[PDB]
C-alpha cells in the first residue's frame with residue numbers, strides 16, 4: 513500500500529504472539545520495541561538516537577508480521593518512547609520512499 | 612524518485628544559502644539540523660527522541676530546497692547526531708512510503 517506522511521506512518525504488527533503498533537521509520541537503522549516478551553538469549557546493545565544513548569537487548573532471528581507480511585530479523589527491546597520498525601525490516605517487506 | 616532502504620535515505624539540501632546532507636526520516640514529525648546559521652528570531656523548544664530530550668531553536672517559514680524541490684517550513688537547529696528531514700517537510704514534496 514501507499515502511505516502519505518500527513519500523519520505518523522503506523523502499522524500493526526504481530527511479534528512473539530503479541531500485537532503492537534510500530535511506526536515505519538526510514539530514519540532508523542534498527543527496529544526497537546518498548547515492552548514485549550521475547551524468548552531466548554540476547555546480546556546487550558547500546559543504541560544512539562536523538563537525545564542520547566540507551567541500553568537495550570538484541571534478539572536475532574525474530575519472526576515478525578508487519579502489516580500482514582511475514583519477515584524475520586533482529587529486534588531490539590528497550591526504553592524507547594515509541595515502537596519503531598527500522599530499515600533492517602522495512603527492506604524485507606520491500607518498502608520504499610517515493611516523491 | 613523512488614528510494615529503497617538498503618542504505619540511509621540521504622538527500623542533498625540547500626538552506627540559508629548553505630549545503631547540507633539530510634536523512635529522509637518518516638519517523639520524525641519535525642526537521643532538525645546540527646549546526647546552521649539561519650537569520651531572524653526563533654523560539655526555544657524541547658523535542659524528545661530515543662535516549663532523551665534536547666533544547667533547540669525553532670525557526671518558522673524557512674526556505675529549504677530538498678532534492679531540487681523548494682519548500683518552506685519550520686526548521687529546528689540543535690544538538691542532533693544527524694540532520695533529519697521530518698514529515699512536516701516530506702509532505703511538502705509529496706513523499707510517500709510504498710510496499
Ligand SMILES: CC(C)(C)NC(=O)[C@@H]1CN(Cc2cccnc2)CCN1C[C@@H](O)C[C@@H](Cc1ccccc1)C(=O)N[C@H]1c2ccccc2C[C@H]1O
Nearest residue numbers: 539540541542561562593594638639641658659660692693
Ligand atoms: C522530531 C524528532 C526529530 C526529535 N523525532 C525523533 O527523534 C523520533 C522520536 N521517536 C520517539 C518519541 C519521543 C518522544 C515523544 N514522541 C515520540 C522515535 C523515532 N525518532 C525518529 C528517528 O528516526 C531519529 C533517528 C535519528 C538519528 C539518525 C542517525 C544517527 C543518530 C540519530 C534515530 O533515532 N536513529 C537511531 C535509532 C532509532 C531506533 C532504533 C535503532 C536506532 C539506531 C539509529 O538509526
